[PDB]
Amino acid sequence: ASHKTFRIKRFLAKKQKQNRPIPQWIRMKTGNKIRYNSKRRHWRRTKLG
Amino acid sequence: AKRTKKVGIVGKYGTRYGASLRKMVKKIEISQHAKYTCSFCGKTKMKRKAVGIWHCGSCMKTVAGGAWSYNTTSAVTVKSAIKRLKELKDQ
Amino acid sequence: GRVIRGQRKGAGSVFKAHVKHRKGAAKLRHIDFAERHGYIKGIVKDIIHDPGRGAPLAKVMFRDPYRFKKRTELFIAAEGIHTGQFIYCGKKAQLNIGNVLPVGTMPEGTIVCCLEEKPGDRGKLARASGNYATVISHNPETKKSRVKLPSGSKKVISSANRAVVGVVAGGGRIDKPILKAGRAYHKYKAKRNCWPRVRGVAMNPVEHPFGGGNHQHIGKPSTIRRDAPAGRKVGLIAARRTGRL
Amino acid sequence: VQRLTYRRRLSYNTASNKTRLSRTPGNRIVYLYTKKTGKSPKSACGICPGRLRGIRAVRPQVLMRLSKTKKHVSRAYGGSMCAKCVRDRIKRAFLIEEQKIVVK
RNA sequence: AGGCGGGCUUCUGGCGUCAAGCGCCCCGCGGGGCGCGACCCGCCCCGGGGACAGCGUCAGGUGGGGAGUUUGACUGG
RNA sequence: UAGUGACGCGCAUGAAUGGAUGAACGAGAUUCCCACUGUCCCUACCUGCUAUCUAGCGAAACCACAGCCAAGGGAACGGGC
RNA sequence: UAGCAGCCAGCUUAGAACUGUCGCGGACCAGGGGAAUCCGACUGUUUAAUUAAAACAAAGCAUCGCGAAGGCCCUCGGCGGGUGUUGACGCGAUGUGAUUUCUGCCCAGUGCUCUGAAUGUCAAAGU
RNA sequence: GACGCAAACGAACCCGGAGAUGCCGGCGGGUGCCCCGGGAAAGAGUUCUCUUUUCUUUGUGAAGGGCAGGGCGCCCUGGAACGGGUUCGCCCCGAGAGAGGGGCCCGCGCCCUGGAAAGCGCCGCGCUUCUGGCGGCGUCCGGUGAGCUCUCGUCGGCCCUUGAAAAUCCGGGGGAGAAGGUGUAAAUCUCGCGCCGGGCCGUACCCAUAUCCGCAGCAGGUCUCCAAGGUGAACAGCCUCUGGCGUGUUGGAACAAGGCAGAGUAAGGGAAGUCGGCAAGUCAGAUCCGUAACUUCGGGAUAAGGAUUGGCUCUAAGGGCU
RNA sequence: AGCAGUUGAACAUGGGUGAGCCGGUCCUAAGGGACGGGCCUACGCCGUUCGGAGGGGAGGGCCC
RNA sequence: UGAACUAUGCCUGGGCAGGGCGAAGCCAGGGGAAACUCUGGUGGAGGCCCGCCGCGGUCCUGACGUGCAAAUCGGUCGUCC
Ligand SMILES: [Mg+2]
Ligand SMILES: [Mg+2]
Ligand SMILES: [Mg+2]
Ligand SMILES: [Mg+2]
Ligand SMILES: [Mg+2]
Ligand SMILES: [Mg+2]
Ligand SMILES: [Mg+2]
Ligand SMILES: [Mg+2]
Ligand SMILES: [Mg+2]
Ligand SMILES: [Mg+2]
Ligand SMILES: [Mg+2]
Ligand SMILES: [Mg+2]
Ligand SMILES: [Mg+2]
Ligand SMILES: [Mg+2]
Ligand SMILES: [Mg+2]
Ligand SMILES: [Mg+2]
Ligand SMILES: [Mg+2]
Ligand SMILES: [Mg+2]
Ligand SMILES: [Mg+2]
Ligand SMILES: [Mg+2]
Ligand SMILES: [Mg+2]
Ligand SMILES: [Mg+2]
Ligand SMILES: [Mg+2]
Ligand SMILES: [Mg+2]
Ligand SMILES: [Mg+2]
Ligand SMILES: [Mg+2]
Ligand SMILES: [Mg+2]
Ligand SMILES: [Mg+2]
Ligand SMILES: [Mg+2]
Ligand SMILES: [Mg+2]
Ligand SMILES: [Mg+2]
Ligand SMILES: [Mg+2]
Ligand SMILES: [Mg+2]
Ligand SMILES: [Mg+2]
Ligand SMILES: [Mg+2]
Ligand SMILES: [Mg+2]
Ligand SMILES: [Mg+2]
Ligand SMILES: [Mg+2]
Ligand SMILES: [Mg+2]
Ligand SMILES: [Mg+2]
Ligand SMILES: [Mg+2]
Ligand SMILES: [Mg+2]
Ligand SMILES: [Mg+2]
Ligand SMILES: [Mg+2]
Ligand SMILES: [Mg+2]
Ligand SMILES: [Mg+2]
Ligand SMILES: [Mg+2]
Ligand SMILES: [Mg+2]
Ligand SMILES: [Mg+2]
Ligand SMILES: [Mg+2]
Ligand SMILES: [Mg+2]
Ligand SMILES: [Mg+2]
Ligand SMILES: [Mg+2]
Ligand SMILES: [Zn+2]
Ligand SMILES: [Zn+2]
């Protein structure tokens, strides 16, 4: 909600920075071995609790 | 003037609770809501505040009396009995 | 089976007393040198209604004899007292209504209330509304007295037990018949969670030893022995007799 | 006619979430949160039902910033006892102390 | 744990707070201290029970409140 | 064969395992009457959304092989002989 | 002086004439009624997802335990905890189920309870 | 005198007040909204005919000063029966009314400081990424209402229901103490003003026929605030303005059977249908009349059974102010 | 995103929440839960204003 | 290991149009020899009545029944100081 605690807001900040797409240069570095981040979550499909 | 022949104050209950029960609450709801003469001022403003509590709206005297009446018949005979036992206790 | 409703009342989860808005414990003043060799003067400040009982309480304000302070005592409002009067507690107190004098210095046939079982417990017997205890006889030899409790049982107590003269206020409260189940709802809503009593015959055999059966019969003698285990001791516990009487 | 809304997070009609309508210089009608009404002091006698006079009726902590003259009267028991019960305490104290001279 | 054992408040919905007084002593007309006032002595704070309640452990009775289990077979179903 | 009022040797009614009665009350069970109506005599017509057709999109239960009948025999009622 | 003059202000009620095709709460909103029987007095509650009832509750009535070293009950346990901030007009345990009118006979059986070491049966310990 | 003055020493200790009291009903004061009257001002709409017409806009914050208004078992004088005062209801008076003169409290209303410089409305000029700026005028005069809400008061009603604690703040009692010796000192509840400081955390958005839960953009579920015009008793139903939306996971062409729904309609008969008036049909608002058996005398009861109802033009009655 | 899409709560790249006086913070309500003590073979549990030599602020120059 | 659903209790908050019958109390006018009566008005009582939101879920044994939904939808219906 709008009323958050510092620990909850610090927990939502990390999950927001983990949900970023894989960098483009990582794909060429690994030779298309890691093409997409296998931990991408959607705010409608997956809930973090 | 008179709008109810028999019920009186218990007409608020309608046809519920029976006849004999509504007859017993009538004699009590009258004495419970009636305002009595204040023994300390003479004004008839001793109305019941709570169960066993009787308060005056003029001298602010609160008297601990009966539940539905000002003074129960048991307490009047006791007060006269204690006054008789006190006199014989001295002499 | 499971435990009966009577067994669950000893745990004290939802069957505890509802003592949120209660004004305190109604008890006499603790016995001190003033109440042993004389009397102490007290003024009745207010007569309040204690949520949960049918007898009012009086806030008598005494004067502390050892420090400059005024103690407030929450007595049982004897029927007849009023705000602004003086209450004298002690041995030398006169035989008036409201005073707290020991039973040893009262004539036979006195009407007392808030009587003490043992010297110091600050008033236990004859404390409900409209009830009283009569002093039957004394005994200066054994320093004991004989009083008649409102249950009709004559109890032999010490002659040093203090008591308030006069009957308790709120008498005749049980004379007005409750008409609605709502008035009984609010009656017990301030006391405890005990009002709706489901009969044992209306239950199943798992919850009560009277439940079950294609009819609502009890099926067993309702008169139960006293040494019966908790769970079976329902109905008429150790009934000496039954009938209309 | 405009339908105005609350101005704080509390969206319930509690005892502290009380508002009133005020017309702003911008020709608008917005809520204006008011403080709870105060009460004038009562007499220490516990008899007179009316409140005391000559004393402000504000909140408790508002009395910290008020001056002393705005919180009492120039009488003996001013600010804590009404005038009618003071003159009765003077007569009761004098007449009781006089009966205690007759006994000697 | 506020006066126990032994040789001063009843006319009123006031007031009561570390002692006035007296005696004695110590310092620089200004301070301080002690005793009486506020009796003396003592073994438990004051009351109510008291070797009885109660506790520990065996023994007998009671005990569907609760636990475990059982409630044969043949058979024109 | 229902309902109601009576009759009572009542398989097996009955007195706080409560008997009898009962104004008011009931989304409780039942009978008759007035009014009313497609419930029926006896069905017909109109309208909206579907079914239908079409562009796009597009499942599931189920499935030994499968799918025309009569009689016969048979595990005493076949689809197959 | 059986009060009048000036000015201002709304919203209702009653009666009458006329009039349209006897239509007018014109849409909308919006109780079918009566005579009886059975059960429960009533309001309330109930099987979330087949049973809303005649079942449960209920006020009233009646019985039963207990004066606190107590009645009822909880905890492995503290002589800890609940009723109890309580004290018989109270708390705990049951049956009946408002009011009206009544509530008969049976204590042999089962159960409860009282009497008692004044007589049988009768453990451990002790003799 | 109630009590008023810008301040107006004061400990321990004590006492009291505020914080801090339910639900319901009646009434009154004030705002907001709505409505009415200006043959008001500024734009817009309508004009085939009529319409001095229709629609929109016409403002003031907190804090302080002043004054209306409301409340008061607050004071003084005085004294009451031929009792009087008074409310919608009540209630009040020798424990002292009525009347006269005062005091205090609440003032969220009005005027002023703020404050018109700003905000809206209209008009003109300059300008097209400094341009995206400068000027003019206006912001007015009243009315009430069984109107609706909110709020502050006040009088009651109900309870075998009496409807919270604490932080914190204040007043009084108390007179222990401190202050200087002839002009000041002690002390000041800012007492007029000045000086410095106020850290940490949350703050976006959705809040539900697509941002929550139910596997989903699920006809379910999920706590509240604001809330207009007309008809009407209504926050009912139907229609409209502000605001929002494209008909709720799709378009097109047909109008067969059979379904779901519109609680569609119907000749004559009117429950003969069916386990059973299931289904839906009649009745329905309001006014004026008229209402039995039975009953616990409260009820039954909107019993049952009749009449009236539009539109238009009038008449009569019910007010306030000077 | 159950048709489509030039659209999106999709995908990608950037940006966005500023307080002495809004709320948390502060208070205790129900209630939770230490301390003393008791209990449990024990991990621990019972109990909550009662119970311990439980007082570490205020004043007079060392008193209380 | 769970009382984010539900059952009961406690603390602290919030909410419940518009109408109807109309009880005690009070005022006035009539009847009386007193006991006390009658009419109108006032007043606004109630686990009172019609009824919106709310809260419930009767009937159609309607719709739906590989549904919008692992319990929902429509009319009707109970209650609403
Ligand atoms: Mg989700
Ligand atoms: Mg059963
Ligand atoms: Mg049984
Ligand atoms: Mg039965
Ligand atoms: Mg049998
Ligand atoms: Mg509201
Ligand atoms: Mg078994
Ligand atoms: Mg088994
Ligand atoms: Mg066998
Ligand atoms: Mg064989
Ligand atoms: Mg027939
Ligand atoms: Mg028959
Ligand atoms: Mg028989
Ligand atoms: Mg029998
Ligand atoms: Mg029978
Ligand atoms: Mg009804
Ligand atoms: Mg029913
Ligand atoms: Mg019926
Ligand atoms: Mg019902
Ligand atoms: Mg086959
Ligand atoms: Mg019969
Ligand atoms: Mg029948
Ligand atoms: Mg019923
Ligand atoms: Mg069910
Ligand atoms: Mg019985
Ligand atoms: Mg029954
Ligand atoms: Mg019998
Ligand atoms: Mg027997
Ligand atoms: Mg509060
Ligand atoms: Mg409160
Ligand atoms: Mg009011
Ligand atoms: Mg006067
Ligand atoms: Mg002072
Ligand atoms: Mg926001
Ligand atoms: Mg959608
Ligand atoms: Mg068709
Ligand atoms: Mg059809
Ligand atoms: Mg027809
Ligand atoms: Mg037939
Ligand atoms: Mg037939
Ligand atoms: Mg039907
Ligand atoms: Mg009838
Ligand atoms: Mg698509
Ligand atoms: Mg985008
Ligand atoms: Mg994204
Ligand atoms: Mg409430
Ligand atoms: Mg009715
Ligand atoms: Mg409803
Ligand atoms: Mg509903
Ligand atoms: Mg339910
Ligand atoms: Mg439904
Ligand atoms: Mg169905
Ligand atoms: Mg189907
Ligand atoms: Zn009086
Ligand atoms: Zn006073």
From Swiss-Prot, chain C:
Residues 206-229 are annotated as: Disordered. It comes from Danio rerio (Zebrafish). The gene is rpl8. Pfam families: Ribosomal_L2 (PF00181), Ribosomal_L2_C (PF03947). Keywords: Cytoplasm, Ribonucleoprotein, Ribosomal protein, RNA-binding, rRNA-binding. Coiled coil: none annotated. This is Large ribosomal subunit protein uL2. GO terms for cellular component: cytosolic large ribosomal subunit. The keyword Coiled coil does not apply. One of its GO terms (biological process) is cytoplasmic translation. Component of the large ribosomal subunit.
UniProtKB/Swiss-Prot annotation, chain D:
It is found in: Cytoplasm, Cytosol; Cytoplasm; Endoplasmic reticulum. One of its GO terms (molecular function) is structural constituent of ribosome. Pfam families: Ribosomal_L34e (PF01199). One of its GO terms (biological process) is translation. Keywords: Cytoplasm, Endoplasmic reticulum, Ribonucleoprotein, Ribosomal protein. GO terms for cellular component: cytosolic large ribosomal subunit; endoplasmic reticulum. The keyword Ribonucleoprotein applies. InterPro entries: Ribosomal_eL34 (IPR008195), Ribosomal_eL34_C_sf (IPR038562), Ribosomal_eL34_CS (IPR018065). Component of the large ribosomal subunit. Component of the large ribosomal subunit. The ribosome is a large ribonucleoprotein complex responsible for the synthesis of proteins in the cell. Belongs to the eukaryotic ribosomal protein eL34 family. PANTHER family: 60S RIBOSOMAL PROTEIN L34. This is Large ribosomal subunit protein eL34. It comes from Danio rerio.
